Amino acid sequence: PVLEPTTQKFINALSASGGPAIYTLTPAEARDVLSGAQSGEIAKPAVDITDTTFAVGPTGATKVRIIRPQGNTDRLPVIVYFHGAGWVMGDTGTHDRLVRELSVRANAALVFVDYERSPEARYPVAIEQDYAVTKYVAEHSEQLNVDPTRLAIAGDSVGGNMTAVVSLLAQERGGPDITAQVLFYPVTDADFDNGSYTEFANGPWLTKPAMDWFWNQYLPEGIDRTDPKITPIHATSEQLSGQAPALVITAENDVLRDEGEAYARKLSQAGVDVTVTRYNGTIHDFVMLNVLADTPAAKGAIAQAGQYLHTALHG
Amino acid sequence: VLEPTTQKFINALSASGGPAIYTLTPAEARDVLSGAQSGEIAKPAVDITDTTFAVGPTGATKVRIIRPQGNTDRLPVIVYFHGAGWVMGDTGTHDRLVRELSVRANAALVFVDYERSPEARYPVAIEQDYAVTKYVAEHSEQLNVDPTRLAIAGDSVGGNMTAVVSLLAQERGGPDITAQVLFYPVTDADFDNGSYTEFANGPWLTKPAMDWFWNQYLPEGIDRTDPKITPIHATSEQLSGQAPALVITAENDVLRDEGEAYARKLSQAGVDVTVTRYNGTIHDFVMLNVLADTPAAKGAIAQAGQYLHTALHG
Numbered sequence: 001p002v003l004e005p006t007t008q009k010f011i012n013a014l015s016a017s018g019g020p021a022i023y024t025l026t027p028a029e030a031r032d033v034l035s036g037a038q039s040g041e042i043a044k045p046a047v048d049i050t051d052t053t054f055a056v057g058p059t060g061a062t063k064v065r066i067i068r069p070q071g072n073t074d075r076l077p078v079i080v081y082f083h084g085a086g087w088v089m090g091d092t093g094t095h096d097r098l099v100r101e102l103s104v105r106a107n108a109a110l111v112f113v114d115y116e117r118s119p120e121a122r123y124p125v126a127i128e129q130d131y132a133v134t135k136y137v138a139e140h141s142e143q144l145n146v147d148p149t150r151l152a153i154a155g156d157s158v159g160g161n162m163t164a165v166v167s168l169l170a171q172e173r174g175g176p177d178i179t180a181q182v183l184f185y186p187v188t189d190a191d192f193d194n195g196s197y198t199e200f201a202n203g204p205w206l207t208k209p210a211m212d213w214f215w216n217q218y219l220p221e222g223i224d225r226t227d228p229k230i231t232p233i234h235a236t237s238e239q240l241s242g243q244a245p246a247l248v249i250t251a252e253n254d255v256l257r258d259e260g261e262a263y264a265r266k267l268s269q270a271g272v273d274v275t276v277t278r279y280n281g282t283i284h285d286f287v288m289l290n291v292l293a294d295t296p297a298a299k300g301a302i303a304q305a306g307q308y309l310h311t312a313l314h315g
Numbered sequence: 316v317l318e319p320t321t322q323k324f325i326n327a328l329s330a331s332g333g334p335a336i337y338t339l340t341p342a343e344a345r346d347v348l349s350g351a352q353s354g355e356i357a358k359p360a361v362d363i364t365d366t367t368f369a370v371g372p373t374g375a376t377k378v379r380i381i382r383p384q385g386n387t388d389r390l391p392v393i394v395y396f397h398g399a400g401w402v403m404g405d406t407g408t409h410d411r412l413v414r415e416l417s418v419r420a421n422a423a424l425v426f427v428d429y430e431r432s433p434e435a436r437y438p439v440a441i442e443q444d445y446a447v448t449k450y451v452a453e454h455s456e457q458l459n460v461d462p463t464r465l466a467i468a469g470d471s472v473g474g475n476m477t478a479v480v481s482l483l484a485q486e487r488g489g490p491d492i493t494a495q496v497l498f499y500p501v502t503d504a505d506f507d508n509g510s511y512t513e514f515a516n517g518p519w520l521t522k523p524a525m526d527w528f529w530n531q532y533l534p535e536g537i538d539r540t541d542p543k544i545t546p547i548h549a550t551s552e553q554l555s556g557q558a559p560a561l562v563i564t565a566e567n568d569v570l571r572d573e574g575e576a577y578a579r580k581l582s583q584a585g586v587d588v589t590v591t592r593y594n595g596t597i598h599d600f601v602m603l604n605v606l607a608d609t610p611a612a613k614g615a616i617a618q619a620g621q622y623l624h625t626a627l628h629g
């Protein structure tokens with residue numbers, strides 16, 4: 001694959017580091033790898049941060065980080081954010097710069113759902129936590145000082161899986177109302193033999209054996225993976241129709257590319273207004289990784305998402 | 316798979332044979348597109364000045380200068396090269412698109428009304444395009460623009476012109492260009508590549524149409540591999556040092572692959588390239604009024620507008 005030069009340099013750095021493959025590690029080891037990779041010094045938007053817990057979801061409690069453009073005490077539209085990193089990894093640290101950018105560019109409060117990770121928690125704990133926080137935000141707008149009629153959901157990778165599943169759950173349960181949804185390179189299927197899985201089975205960055213491992217951490221052995229709450233590519237027209245306008249951003253060189261774009265087609269053919277954009281020359285995780293933060297694809301996609309959300313939440 | 320409104324537009328054309336635009340005279344084709352780009356559509360408000368610059372290989376180039384309505388400041392400036400196959404296109408067909416770019420970029424925009432084919436041939440239009448870009452850089456007080464914040468942009472054959480103007484500026488020592496924007500550019504003349512084969516019979520743009528357009532543009536017998544004709548053939552040294560570029564392609568477009576391949580060449584020559592493919596849409600999707608409310612059109616215009624705003628005011 002022809003990668004943007006800085007992105008190629010990163011990939012070269014990686015294969016020259018000779019590390020062990022992420023899926024040979026323990027969950028705690030894998031968490032620390034990504035946390036350390038994202039611990040470098042890098043400029044970030046100025047925000048006010050409140051870490052707390054909402055007494056909602058199937059475990060009885062869900063940890064959340066609430067972010068707002070620094071010094072802004074107005075009643076703001078709100079983004080509920082579901083982070084990625086394979087269900088196993090990711091935290092408020094790994095995704096900090098990305099979600100700050102979304103909060104400030106959208107001029108919105110952002111509620112980061114620090115959901116229970118896998119394999120300690122399997123399907124469906126996280127998606128139900130995610131749904132419960134989204135409902136909580138919609139129902140406690142005075143307590144959060146947000147406008148619940150301008151509520152967006154967004155996520156990256158497995159977090160894009162959660163975005164689509166929260167949209168589906170909200171359709172089935174009659175709410176809450178969602179203004180717009182943003183999905184960065186979402187996981188939507190478990191077909192490890194499709195076009196982009198084949199083309200990028202060995203990378204860069206994300207591999208087919210890693211996806212196999214991640215799915216196995218997320219799901220109990222033997223469950224039917226075609227359920228749309230697991231692989232939303234299988235959602236019916238009636239489950240997709242009526243959902244909020246969506247922005248789907250894919251990476252050209254990513255095993256997940258084809259399923260993300262196929263899901264966007266399914267949404268569009270159900271009558272949903274879908275903005276779908278492939279960024280050439282970049283890789284999986286390109287709006288999260290600090291090392292790619294100055295590449296044209298990262299800058300362009302974060303700017304596109306931020307402007308999409310600002311228009312949705314303030315237009 | 317096409318976005319539903321886009322599909323509906325294509326289905327409205329099912330009796331047109333492509334459209335078989337290449338079966339018409341140049342004047343008839345021009346009127347077909349001009350009519351298609353009439354109707355009802357919202358557009359941003361701009362001030363307009365139609366004039367002629369005494370420049371280019373024929374001694375005169377017609378231009379339309381626009382600015383956000385009522386804005387008297389010294390603005391950054393976009394020089395814009397319109398598409399529609401060298402044969403068609405005018406201030407009317409591209410009006411909504413260039414108004415959006417001007418207002419979203421908060422910039423003056425100089426619309427080059429270059430001599431169209433087959434009345435004019437290569438290289439008249441590209442030399443007019445380069446001459447106007449130079450003229451703008453050198454007459455900034457007359458035009459009330461900031462020539463240190465100058466971008467070039469174009470769609471389709473206008474994207475071909477953008478690439479060629481960038482190259483000519485490299486060869487001739489200027490003017491300096493801050494950014495360049497290329498919507499689904501023409502960069503090659505390989506009618507057997509992947510997207511040409513996949514979309515040979517449409518939608519909207521067909522292989523026979525491209526054959527016709529190229530034949531209207533070029534004198535018989537010229538080597539089409541020259542980079543001032545097919546900039547996909549530009550050397551690393553011709554591409555290196557060019558201004559950062561935004562290249563936007565449509566998924567369902569014979570020209571998709573050459574646009575994306577040209578973005579790759581620019582990127583490997585060290586140019587900072589933002590390259591994005593919009594799925595569900597077709598060739599011409601940021602110009603056509605009938606698609607102006609589709610998500611791809613809205614997204615690509617908002618992206619280009621913000622990219623230009625950042626380049627010219629950052």
Ligand SMILES: O=[N+]([O-])c1ccc(O)cc1
Nearest residue numbers: 334336347348519520524
């Ligand atoms: O007006 N028309 O039918 C057209 C115009 C332009 C084009 O590229 C194809 C068909």
